[PDB]
Design a protein around this ligand. Structure first.
Ligand SMILES: Cc1cc2nc3c(=O)[nH]c(=O)nc-3n(C[C@H](O)[C@H](O)[C@H](O)COP(=O)(O)O)c2cc1C
Ligand SMILES: [Ca+2]
Length: 166
């Protein structure tokens, strides 16, 4: 039903959504969610298409809640198929996301004109709606070494998360 309800009943405070077509963003999401345990927290990865992201407004019910988005960009700067509902919702919504804390890691390739469009958009839109960005937008480049871009981001991400939540 609701992802916030699932997190509450399974003890998770971190949820990582993945916008993926070929599985790269899903694997990064799984890796980030497992990392949570190394810092005394608990996370889970999730396919946004299976949920209603309007529920983000209920996230502040969970202590030290953090939502992370690992999003790939396809086509003409389009979202992946599984992130279309989320993309559509983001464009038309006006909900207040005060209290929400987020971070975004975008998967793209610098050779396309619309480099990491999806990741850049989600990052910008969440802040516009009232959410608080806890760590800078990661811009992974699949034309170079995406894996290394991810590791560099992740290496600095956790210390920042720990710093923020104490
Ligand atoms: C057919 C196709 C089109 C792509 N189009 C874009 C694009 O317009 N912008 C961009 O930054 N990256 C683009 N990329 C590259 C990616 O988003 C990169 O491969 C990402 O790692 C894919 O993640 P995923 O496995 O989770 O689906 C494209 C990749 C493919 C195969
Ligand atoms: Ca506010």
């Amino acid at each position: 039903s609701s992802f916030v309800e699932k997190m509450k009943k399974t003890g998770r405070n971190i949820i990582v959504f993945y916008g993926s077509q070929t599985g790269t963003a899903e694997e990064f999401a799984n890796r980030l969610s497992k990392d949570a345990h190394r810092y005394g927290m608990r996370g889970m990865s999730a396919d946004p298409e299976e949920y209603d992201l309007a529920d983000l407004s209920s996230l502040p019910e969970i202590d030290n809640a953090l939502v992370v988005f690992c999003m790939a960009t396809y086509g003409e700067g389009d979202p992946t198929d599984n992130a279309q509902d989320f993309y559509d919702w983001l464009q038309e919504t006006d909900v207040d996301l005060s209290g929400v804390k987020f971070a975004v890691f975008g998967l793209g390739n610098k050779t396309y004109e619309h480099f990491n469009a999806m990741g850049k958009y989600v990052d910008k839109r969440l802040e516009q709606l009232g959410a608080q960005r806890i760590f800078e937008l990661g811009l992974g480049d699949d034309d170079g070494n995406l894996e290394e871009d991810f590791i560099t981001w992740r290496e600095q991400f956790w210390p920042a998360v720990c710093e923020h939540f104490g």
